[PDB]
Amino acid sequence: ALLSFERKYRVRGGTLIGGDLFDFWVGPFYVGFFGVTTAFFALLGTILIFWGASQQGTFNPWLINIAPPDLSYGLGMAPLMEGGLWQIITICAIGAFVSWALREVEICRKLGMGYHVPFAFSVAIFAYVTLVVFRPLLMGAWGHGFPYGIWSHLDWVSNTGYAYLHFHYNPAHMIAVTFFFTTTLALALHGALVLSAANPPKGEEVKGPDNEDTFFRDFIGYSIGTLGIHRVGLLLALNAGFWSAVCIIISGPVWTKGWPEWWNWWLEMPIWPS
Amino acid sequence: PEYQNIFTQVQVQGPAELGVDNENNLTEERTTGTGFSQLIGWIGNAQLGPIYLGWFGIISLVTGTLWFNIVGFNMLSQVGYSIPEFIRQLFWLALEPPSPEYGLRMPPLDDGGWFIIASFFLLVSVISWWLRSYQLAEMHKMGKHVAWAFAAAIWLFLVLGLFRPILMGSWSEAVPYGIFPHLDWTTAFSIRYGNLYYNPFHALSIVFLYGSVLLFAMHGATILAVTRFGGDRELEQIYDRGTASERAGLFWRWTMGFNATMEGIHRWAWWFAVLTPITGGIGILLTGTVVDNWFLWAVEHNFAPDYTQDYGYEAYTTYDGFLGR
Amino acid sequence: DLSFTGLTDEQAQELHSVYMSGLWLFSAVAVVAHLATFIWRPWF
Amino acid sequence: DLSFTGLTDEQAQELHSVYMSGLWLFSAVAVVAHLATFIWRPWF
Amino acid sequence: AGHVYANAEVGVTCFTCHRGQAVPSEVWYRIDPVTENTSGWASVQNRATSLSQFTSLPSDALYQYLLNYEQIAVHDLESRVETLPGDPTWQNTERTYSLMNYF
Amino acid sequence: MEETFFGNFDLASLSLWLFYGFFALLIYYLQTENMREGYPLEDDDGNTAANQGPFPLPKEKTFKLQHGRGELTLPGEDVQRRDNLALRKTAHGNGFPMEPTGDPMLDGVGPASWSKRRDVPELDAHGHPKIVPMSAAEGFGVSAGTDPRGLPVMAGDGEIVGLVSDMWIDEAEQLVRYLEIELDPEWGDGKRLVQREMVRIKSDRVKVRSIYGKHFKNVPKTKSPNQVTLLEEDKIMAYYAGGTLYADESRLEPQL
Amino acid sequence: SKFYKIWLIFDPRRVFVAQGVFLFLLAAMIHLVLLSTEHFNWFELAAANAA
Amino acid sequence: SKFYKIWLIFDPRRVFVAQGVFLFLLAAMIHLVLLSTEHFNWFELAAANAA
Amino acid sequence: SKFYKIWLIFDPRRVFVAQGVFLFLLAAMIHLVLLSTEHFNWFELAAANAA
Amino acid sequence: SKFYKIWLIFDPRRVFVAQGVFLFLLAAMIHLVLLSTEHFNWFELAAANAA
Amino acid sequence: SKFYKIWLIFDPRRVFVAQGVFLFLLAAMIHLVLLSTEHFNWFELAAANA
Amino acid sequence: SKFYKIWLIFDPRRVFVAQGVFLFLLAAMIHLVLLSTEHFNWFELAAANAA
Amino acid sequence: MTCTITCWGIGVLLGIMTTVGLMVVGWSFLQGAFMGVLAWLIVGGVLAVAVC
Ligand code: BCL
Ligand code: BCL
Ligand code: BCL
Ligand code: BCL
Ligand SMILES: CC[C@H]1c2cc3[nH]c4c(c3C)C(=O)[C@H](C(=O)OC)c4c3nc(cc4[nH]c(cc(n2)[C@@H]1C)c(C(C)=O)c4C)[C@@H](C)[C@@H]3CCC(=O)OC/C=C(\C)CCC[C@H](C)CCC[C@H](C)CCCC(C)C
Ligand code: HEC
Ligand code: HEC
Ligand SMILES: COC(C)(C)C(=O)/C=C/C(C)=C/C=C/C(C)=C/C=C/C(C)=C/C=C/C=C(C)/C=C/C=C(/C)CC/C=C(/C)CCC=C(C)C
Ligand SMILES: COC(C)(C)C(=O)/C=C/C(C)=C/C=C/C(C)=C/C=C/C(C)=C/C=C/C=C(C)/C=C/C=C(/C)CC/C=C(/C)CCC=C(C)C
Ligand SMILES: COC(C)(C)C(=O)/C=C/C(C)=C/C=C/C(C)=C/C=C/C(C)=C/C=C/C=C(C)/C=C/C=C(\C)CC/C=C(/C)CCC=C(C)C
Ligand SMILES: COC(C)(C)C(=O)\C=C/C(C)=C/C=C/C(C)=C/C=C/C(C)=C/C=C\C=C(C)\C=C\C=C(\C)CC/C=C(/C)CCC=C(C)C
């Protein structure tokens, strides 16, 4: 159904391709040309996961594991039950993610708003793309992608992390992790200010932007503002996604030794006395 | 293309905003010294306004320096007061926790005794800063969400260095005060107790850590997408919903079938961020005190994946084949 | 008298009669489908 | 007289007549395709 | 023979360690104290030494494990154990991990 | 403690299920708090929808608005509802787009649609209107970037529709909100506001691409030149965004 | 009986879509459940019968 | 029968899109299931038949 | 009795979807619990009986 | 006695929803507890009696 | 005594829900604690008596 | 028979673009499927056939 | 601006020049890059303030 104010926004137009052939809503969801392709790719990918789960012998969501082919297969196609199903699901997943981002473009174009959200999602797609196709392409085998399992893909992260003997020493991991712990820092404080101002102690008037502007001024000596927090906030999270993409694309295609060994440039600088 | 509101293209600077006031008389303890930075003004507000310095703030600042200095003086003395070596090994030196042989007793100053004293000042410094956040909210007549969210972060902070070492019966379980050493502790902690990936609360904390960055990328992009309708003025959009709140809601309703309000977005924002250390604190508190091995816990509870392929490299290739000879 | 969907009393009766006719036809196909499978490989 | 789409009874009756023409034709091609495949390599 | 003849007949000769040098390369000495103002677990680590493998992990791992027969295993062998005093801690894991980057 | 309560249900497993109950309650609490505006759902015809969702409406919460603006309970009749919308349904059923019956930008439907906010200016802590022109603002001046005052304004089709005479600032936050455009007699009659977020400021000009030259004469005006109400703010901003789809048929029609 | 009154409570459009998704997910799930079993996997049985 | 009334509640241009995706979803999914099996993978059977 | 007044408390159109989801999730879970047990797994029993 | 006044304090709608959820989760937990034990697991006892 | 004045301080709605949540969680914990012990576990005791 | 009415409900210019993209992507997909195999890779067969 | 960006652009160019210059006289790419990064931040920052 609609909302109390949704009717005036459900106007014709704003599509990128397909026009009014697909321009309709199914329930609350907007269906476009890319909503059709999202439905096809997401359903095909989801079904193939359960088809692979059926032949794997278990339907347990924790134990479901669609793994990539062996490194011997290289960049070619593998038998569907020897890692080939993972390749098709990856194609379906990439097609579903791109369609989802392009569907968001149609939605925000129909609403006359900025394309920040589809761009921000594209960074998440890029982080997935650099994990499943870009890094395997550079390393010469599709078997370097993570498997499609709830807990099976954690073993890939653990093994790939220890494939460089201490993965915390990755300089791009440090930058990326610093962005996650700070993005959650910014989310906690930004969500707190609006809630604190809009929900004062009972029996007292709500506060405006000035009161929260002067609160962190009184708290930490500086306030970035109502608009600034969303601007730095998108940048903090986008940098978190981007630098996470960087830390894994340099682990193996650009750096093969241990990550602690990378910091040897700093230790043995000529300026440091022996 | 259309102006993406990422950097302000024109800055206006007027008289410095000293802040609001009420009968609590905030202006007594304010510094009344303001500066304007045009570099930070491109992305955010340009005024480096006055800071309210109370007694919780001063005590936290003073005691935090003592912890900072005691750690620093030890690190400097660790390298024999060699400043070039102190700078070179700055990321490697630390104030290591006490040896496990001392239990919860006070260890010698060179074997973690200064660690406890430095930790004592850090604990006082962190709690004092939290009291400042609580007191400032009460004196600003606003909600205590900033203090409550901070307390969630302190919960993991207290569990890591105070609660779990007490429950484990040894001060050696604390985290070393070093750049790399607390990374080594993070890796060693996972290895010692099985695999922390298989800790459900570590997995749960990652869900909210991923969700926090996911939401705050979503919220930041959505607000910037509707900032052409004054969406950055969220508070006025809560008391009087404009088209910025409507289009922001309808964008996510048409995308994923449900949305939030301009106020309800921050409740999602607050709780996902707050649940990140709360679940992490529980997962760390249950590590060693209860479990001591998480992968075996996963195997026992039947959510550890099982692999049928062989493990050696000889099963997939040969040494000469890998070398290309 | 009570209807959250706006359908009249007789309108719902007409809709349900066709729905049951479709339900029985779908079920009749399944019964034959189950019957053929049971002869193929019984599970009892 | 229920009509959630605005089509009259005759309008949908003639549209549904075409739908079964497509449905039966699609099923008829599927039957021949399934019949040929079973002769090729039966699954029963 | 179970190590030097693991896969094929590789073997070990005098050239294996020396490689044309009077003293073999990659030999190690016990640089135990490393740190000046600390004792105990704090005096064997927290410094990027030659044996620390570019980490702040303990530099006595080679001395304790490959010369002193110290216990390398640190994991608990069942799902839940009673963490009695004297059991391996994360410090022992840190030292085992220090030896093991060397591997 | 390392003992299982039953089977393999230890203290670690107990805490996990305790969080499952809390999170389920939290999800219910978070979702209901998100339903203070926009509900009941209704349908295309405007009647209340048969389906209202699994979550019930939350209990009313009351906001004590400042500056003597009364109370506010979000769950209830919405004063921002717009009446006499100039749209018609393209289908007799639900889930289909509405076709505007006239000029979509003039009627304010779709991307050009505004909301019936309060017809009073937003006020800062002091009480006076939040957004004021720099001429009225005291002690304010340009500190960085290009000053848009005096630069010609270029529309989406390249037409020069006037020059920026003044720009409105949020003196509470020291941020630029709008730019006044002194419309040329060939294009408009008086002064029109354009939000800072839809205008790109160059060295020699300010360019707004959403609105063509012929659409500036129809930009909503303000009752007074010293302040802008929330209603005028909502009408002005929505008009420019509506041009992103309604400036020409090419924008509305699919790009491929 | 009077089961037809379900349509006075439930919209016919949303229920029909609900069962169409549910019934196919039923059909997909049950078919996959048999394909997991070694006895009711008609694809492997064709290979065994071919010999 | 009177199944023609299904178009009185479902609009033709919103269901034909629904079944178009669903029919191609089945056609593509079932073919891939056959390709997964070693008995009904007509591509490799040509190689096996030709030796 | 007087249990009909529960509909004066609960919305009938929200309970029915609540129990419709609950009843199927009930039915699926008990079926899955039975399949986990080796005695009540009718799929393996059919395989064993065929031998 | 005079406990009827609890409904002057508790909303009947919120409590009934909470009570219904609580009762099933409590019932499910106790059933799961019995299944964990090797003496009250009726599924394993049926297998033992059959054998 | 005259402890009835506690309700002049505490809201009955908030205390009653807190008491109900507290009572069950306390009752559940004690039942769980007994199940952990080798002595008072009535499920394992019934198996032993068999 | 009377399928010409499909253009009374679907826009001819919107469908043609959509089915043009579908036809090429299907054609490219099937060609790549053939290239993935050994029996139907005409590029590899020519090399193998020519000594 | 038109001057701070140019000063920032000058600094990064000098950082690249100092990066390759250290490689030519020995050092390493990573060691040279850090001084280049340091030169970009210091010289670029000093220029961005000293000249405007
Ligand atoms: C395993 C043994 C056989 C096998 C056994 C079978 C069997 C058995 C069957 C098929 C069937 C099909 N097989 Mg097969 N099939 C095999 C190998 C293949 C190969 C291949 C390269 O190897 C291909 C391409 C196909 C392809 C197909 C399709 C022809 C068909 C299913 C249609 C469908 O899913 O989409 C249809 C879905 C759609 C909605 C797509 C519509 C897209 C178009 C562009 C929409 C245009 C509509 C527009 C409005 C214009 C309207 C005009 C109207 C004409 C008026 N098979 C192997 C070799 N295959 C099934 C079938 O039904 O055939 C009829 C069938 O019964
Ligand atoms: C032994 C393990 C090593 C380690 C090895 C690795 C490895 C290996 C990796 C990381 C990577 C990451 N590590 Mg590390 N790392 C370690 C320790 C840590 C610690 C810590 C406190 O100790 C932290 C915080 C991190 C943090 C991180 C981030 C930098 C990053 C996480 C992925 C990412 O950003 O998202 C990016 C991923 C996405 C954005 C997903 C995209 C989602 C798609 C587009 C949408 C999904 C839709 C889907 C279908 C769901 C829809 C279904 C329903 C309908 C909703 N690491 C340890 C030391 N780390 C990972 C990384 O960077 O990946 C790029 C990486 O590969
Ligand atoms: C080999 C590494 C192990 C690992 C071991 C650990 C350990 C050990 C821990 C985590 C924990 C965390 N891990 Mg892990 N983790 C690994 C792999 C990962 C991966 C990944 C992609 O692989 C990711 C994303 C994560 C992610 C996370 C986060 C979800 C979580 C931290 C919560 C938090 O916000 O902390 C942020 C909180 C703080 C930083 C502490 C609070 C700080 C206080 C309040 C601030 C005081 C400031 C101080 C005074 C200094 C002030 C100075 C100012 C300049 C003035 N881990 C692998 C399995 N992980 C934590 C956890 O378990 O949570 C349950 C934890 O303890
Ligand atoms: C194990 C032995 C047999 C087996 C035994 C059975 C048995 C027994 C049964 C099935 C069932 C079915 N099997 Mg089987 N099945 C096997 C192998 C297969 C294979 C295969 C390639 O191997 C296929 C394709 C199928 C496929 C099917 C379908 C025919 C059917 C499931 C319908 C359903 O789930 O969704 C139903 C989907 C929906 C309800 C939505 C449909 C969407 C459409 C497009 C909506 C259009 C609506 C629109 C408004 C037009 C309306 C027009 C109306 C006429 C008015 N089976 C094995 C070989 N199979 C089950 C069944 O349902 O039979 C009826 C059944 O009882
Ligand atoms: C800036 C980077 C951050 C980010 C941003 C981001 N993500 C986004 C967005 C944005 C701005 C959206 O607008 C979009 C959205 O609508 O979210 C609600 C989205 C989104 N990112 C999501 C989740 C998500 N975000 C993550 C992280 C992040 N995304 C970063 C922290 C992660 C992580 C860390 O893993 C996840 C899981 C979704 C909720 C949504 C994307 C929805 C989508 O793609 O829908 C289409 C697809 C389907 C409905 C299903 C497709 C199924 C496939 C065909 C098969 C399976 C493939 C997959 C590889 C399975 C693997 C499973 C195993 C790994 C367990
Ligand atoms: C696996 C390595 C190992 C092998 C095998 C090996 N040595 Fe050594 N050797 C050592 C070590 C360790 C040292 C001590 C380091 C040093 O003195 O530089 C050493 C030292 C020596 C020295 C004294 C060096 C000095 O500084 O004067 C001599 C001589 C010697 N080796 C002879 C031999 C000869 C001859 C062989 C061939 C049979 C041989 N070694 C093989 C390990 C080995
Ligand atoms: C050539 C293979 C080799 C390498 C490389 C290696 N290990 Fe080991 N590891 C061993 C051996 C051999 C042992 C057995 C020592 C013992 O149990 O006395 C061991 C034992 C361990 C232990 C003790 C576990 C337990 O409690 O039994 C840990 C910790 C460990 N390894 C971690 C690591 C990590 C982390 C890495 C990645 C840097 C790694 N290992 C790489 C060979 C190696
Ligand atoms: C995990 O466990 C394992 C063991 C694996 C498992 O499998 C568990 C299985 C479990 C739990 C089974 C769960 C299945 C259940 C509960 C079965 C529900 C199935 C039902 C209820 C059947 C509905 C059929 C409805 C149709 C098909 C109507 C046809 C409609 C026709 C088309 C009429 C419409 C026609 C019109 C003209 C419109 C109406 C009229 C007007 C508009 C006038
Ligand atoms: C996972 O498990 C494994 C075992 C792997 C698996 O595979 C499981 C498979 C499973 C479960 C498959 C379940 C199959 C099902 C449910 C079959 C649905 C298929 C159906 C229902 C067939 C519809 C055919 C519709 C057409 C083809 C109409 C043609 C339309 C034409 C074009 C007419 C319209 C034209 C017009 C002109 C209209 C007139 C217009 C005016 C008058 C304006
Ligand atoms: C952890 O492991 C161990 C330790 C082993 C463990 O398991 C611990 C177990 C522990 C602690 C058990 C804790 C259980 C407790 C405390 C039992 C609470 C349960 C209760 C109290 C039962 C309520 C029943 C109410 C009903 C069923 C009403 C039915 C009402 C019907 C539906 C009529 C509808 C009502 C109306 C009013 C009509 C409307 C009228 C008008 C509108 C006029
Ligand atoms: C230039 O100036 C001079 C001065 C020269 C200098 O050097 C400057 C100082 C320099 C460079 C030192 C740089 C410091 C560095 C790198 C330290 C990084 C720090 C890091 C990573 C922190 C890890 C996390 C630790 C936890 C998680 C703690 C939690 C523990 C808390 C505190 C709980 C309380 C604990 C107790 C035990 C209570 C004791 C109390 C009683 C017993 C009552």
PDB file of N, CA, C and O in Angstrom, chain F residues 12 26 32 91 105 143 157 169 179 256:
ATOM      1  N   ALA F  12      27.577 -19.349  27.732  1.00  0.00           N
ATOM      2  CA  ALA F  12      27.753 -18.646  26.466  1.00  0.00           C
ATOM      3  C   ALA F  12      26.532 -18.812  25.572  1.00  0.00           C
ATOM      4  O   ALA F  12      26.117 -17.866  24.893  1.00  0.00           O
ATOM      5  N   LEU F  26      13.912  -5.312  20.413  1.00  0.00           N
ATOM      6  CA  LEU F  26      14.473  -4.065  19.905  1.00  0.00           C
ATOM      7  C   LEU F  26      14.015  -3.789  18.479  1.00  0.00           C
ATOM      8  O   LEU F  26      13.695  -2.646  18.137  1.00  0.00           O
ATOM      9  N   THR F  32       8.357   0.195  15.200  1.00  0.00           N
ATOM     10  CA  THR F  32       7.186   0.971  15.597  1.00  0.00           C
ATOM     11  C   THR F  32       7.529   2.447  15.761  1.00  0.00           C
ATOM     12  O   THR F  32       6.739   3.316  15.380  1.00  0.00           O
ATOM     13  N   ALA F  91      -4.082   3.747 -14.010  1.00  0.00           N
ATOM     14  CA  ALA F  91      -4.730   2.447 -13.967  1.00  0.00           C
ATOM     15  C   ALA F  91      -5.819   2.468 -12.908  1.00  0.00           C
ATOM     16  O   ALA F  91      -5.758   3.241 -11.949  1.00  0.00           O
ATOM     17  N   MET F 105       5.343  21.018 -12.449  1.00  0.00           N
ATOM     18  CA  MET F 105       6.095  21.938 -11.601  1.00  0.00           C
ATOM     19  C   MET F 105       5.185  22.993 -10.988  1.00  0.00           C
ATOM     20  O   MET F 105       5.353  23.364  -9.821  1.00  0.00           O
ATOM     21  N   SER F 143      34.204  34.284   3.736  1.00  0.00           N
ATOM     22  CA  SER F 143      35.510  33.937   4.272  1.00  0.00           C
ATOM     23  C   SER F 143      36.315  33.009   3.378  1.00  0.00           C
ATOM     24  O   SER F 143      37.542  32.969   3.508  1.00  0.00           O
ATOM     25  N   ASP F 157      19.416  25.229 -19.820  1.00  0.00           N
ATOM     26  CA  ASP F 157      19.554  25.309 -21.266  1.00  0.00           C
ATOM     27  C   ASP F 157      20.552  26.374 -21.701  1.00  0.00           C
ATOM     28  O   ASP F 157      20.621  26.695 -22.891  1.00  0.00           O
ATOM     29  N   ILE F 169      21.714  33.300   4.401  1.00  0.00           N
ATOM     30  CA  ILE F 169      22.618  32.503   5.216  1.00  0.00           C
ATOM     31  C   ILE F 169      21.904  32.059   6.482  1.00  0.00           C
ATOM     32  O   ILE F 169      20.951  32.693   6.944  1.00  0.00           O
ATOM     33  N   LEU F 179      20.451  31.622  -2.647  1.00  0.00           N
ATOM     34  CA  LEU F 179      20.962  32.766  -3.391  1.00  0.00           C
ATOM     35  C   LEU F 179      19.773  33.472  -4.019  1.00  0.00           C
ATOM     36  O   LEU F 179      18.970  32.836  -4.709  1.00  0.00           O
ATOM     37  N   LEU F 256      17.556   5.409 -22.323  1.00  0.00           N
ATOM     38  CA  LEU F 256      17.984   4.381 -23.264  1.00  0.00           C
ATOM     39  C   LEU F 256      16.792   3.603 -23.808  1.00  0.00           C
ATOM     40  O   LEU F 256      15.999   4.128 -24.588  1.00  0.00           O
TER      41      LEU F 256
END
